[PDB]
Amino acid sequence: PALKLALEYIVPCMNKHGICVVDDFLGKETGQQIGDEVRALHDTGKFTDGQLVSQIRGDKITWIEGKEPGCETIGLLMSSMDDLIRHCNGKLGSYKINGRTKAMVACYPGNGTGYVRHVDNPNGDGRCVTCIYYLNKDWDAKVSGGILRIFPEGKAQFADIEPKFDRLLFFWSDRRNPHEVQPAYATRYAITVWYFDADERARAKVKYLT
Numbered sequence: 001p002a003l004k005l006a007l008e009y010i011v012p013c014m015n016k017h018g019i020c021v022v023d024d025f026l027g028k029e030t031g032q033q034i035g036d037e038v039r040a041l042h043d044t045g046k047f048t049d050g051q052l053v054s055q056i057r058g059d060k061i062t063w064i065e066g067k068e069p070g071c072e073t074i075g076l077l078m079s080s081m082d083d084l085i086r087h088c089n090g091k092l093g094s095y096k097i098n099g100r101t102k103a104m105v106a107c108y109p110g111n112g113t114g115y116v117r118h119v120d121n122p123n124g125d126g127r128c129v130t131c132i133y134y135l136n137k138d139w140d141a142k143v144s145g146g147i148l149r150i151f152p153e154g155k156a157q158f159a160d161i162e163p164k165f166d167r168l169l170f171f172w173s174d175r176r177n178p179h180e181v182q183p184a185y186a187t188r189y190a191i192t193v194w195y196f197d198a199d200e201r202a203r204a205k206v207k208y209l210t
């Protein structure tokens with residue numbers, strides 16, 4: 001359960017490696033339901049965020065609050081993510097997590113598109129923990145690719161994360177974990193939520209106002 005999973009794995013694993021994976025997070029029924037909602041978003045051309053603003057990502061994204069009609073199971077996923085982070089309260093490094101972003105739903109077309117190497121939060125914008133959920137049924141990375149490769153600072157080796165179905169991924173959002181998405185040869189879906197550190201976000205606000 002959430003508390004046991006948080007205190008006995010996520011907290012120790014995050015403090016040791018900064019990268020954490022939870023498999024079969026929600027179960028098959030809920031996983032396929034989340035997939036159905038995401039596919040509905042894709043089929044009705046909802047991945048149009050940024051499409052009206054001038055400058056280059058190759059994927060398509062949309063932001064989900066979780067309470068929109070047809071997005072309820074995504075909201076349920078977001079609730080479960082929150083339960084875990086809440087049960088970690090105060091024990092995740094030195095962070096005091098007080099908020100989060102909406103869910104970013106990302107679609108990778110499958111024509112070799114991936115995501116260039118980057119750092120999620122390199123300039124202290126307040127994001128401390130990156131949470132990704134994968135909903136790709138029967139993903140065989142040997143053929144379909146789409147592996148997320150993370151290069152943790154203070155490790156010799158890199159960490160390869162297959163976007164397997166019903167998999168949850170946690171990692172520090174700062175310079176410790178640069179990462180890239182390898183080319184995708186099948187439609188690849190991911191849902192990402194970012195949690196905020198209170199004081200770092202306050203410092204960021206002060207910088208914006210100063």
Ligand SMILES: O=C(NCc1ccc(Oc2ccccc2)cc1)c1cnc(-n2cccn2)nc1O
Pocket residue numbers: 101115118119120121125126127179180181194
């Ligand atoms: O950083 C990102 N996008 C910009 C962003 C994200 C969240 C934000 O929320 C807030 C809101 C308010 C204050 C601070 C942050 C803001 C900007 C971002 C990071 N990785 C990826 N990957 C794609 C594949 C693997 N990784 N794609 C991304 O688009």
Ligand SMILES: [Mn+2]
Pocket residue numbers: 118119120179
């Ligand atoms: Mn990223």
